[PDB]
Amino acid sequence: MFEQRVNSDVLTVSTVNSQDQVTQKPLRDSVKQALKNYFAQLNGQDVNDLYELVLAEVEQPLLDMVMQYTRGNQTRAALMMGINRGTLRKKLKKYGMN
Amino acid sequence: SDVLTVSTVNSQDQVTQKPLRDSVKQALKNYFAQLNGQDVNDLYELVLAEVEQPLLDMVMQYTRGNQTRAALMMGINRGTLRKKLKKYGMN
DNA sequence: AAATTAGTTTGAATTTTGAGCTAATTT
DNA sequence: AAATTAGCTCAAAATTCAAACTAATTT
């Protein structure tokens, strides 16, 4: 009665395919393509912050959406994110969203 | 100005970059839409695993398996990296 | 009026980090 | 032959955490 939804089809993105059909692909792939383009535009320059970079690039929308969803309620936001409320307030401060 | 972008196409077959954060945001909007007031519990680990896996995979590819250089690139400790590789069973 | 939340501290648990070591591997 | 890396420990630095508690908000 219940079809398996793979972890990878939970957070998905609308894409256009070789037959100009709209399909949902994993967010993984967005991250992969972004990273491939980032790597492609390096030309052997040295990197030391890739994790923080991606992490910021991903934490910011997450907080944005979860704050919109809870209508500013940090406790609920923290509770649905699965993190301590203080950690959440910290992150919110980090991205100037309080 | 945006180092992490993905490629989009519009109805006029023009290709254009867009920040990865727009993708993440879309995916979340879709997530919140798909569930109807069902409770979310571990959204951070969800997304973080969802973002950490292809990152590790791509940096390990870029450094041809060299964990020390991968770790240096990412700006984390080699131990942390080994741990993360263990976590997603890629080692 | 109750309840819930924000804003803050405090100390414990967990995680990340660096550094040191030898074995194995790459150069 | 040398240099680098992996696999591994130790403990200490940093971060996350829960538990308070009152003021302030919301219900």
Numbering used by the authors:
A (entry chain B): 1 to 98
B (entry chain A): 8 to 98
Article passage:
Fis is one of a handful of nucleoid-associated proteins that bind prolifically throughout bacterial chromosomes. The importance of the A/T-rich center (-2 to +2) is due to the requirement for a compressed minor groove, which enables the recognition helices in the Fis dimer to contact the consecutive major grooves.
We first tested the effects of individually substituting base pairs flanking the core at positions ±8, ±9, and ±10 in the context of the high affinity F1 site.
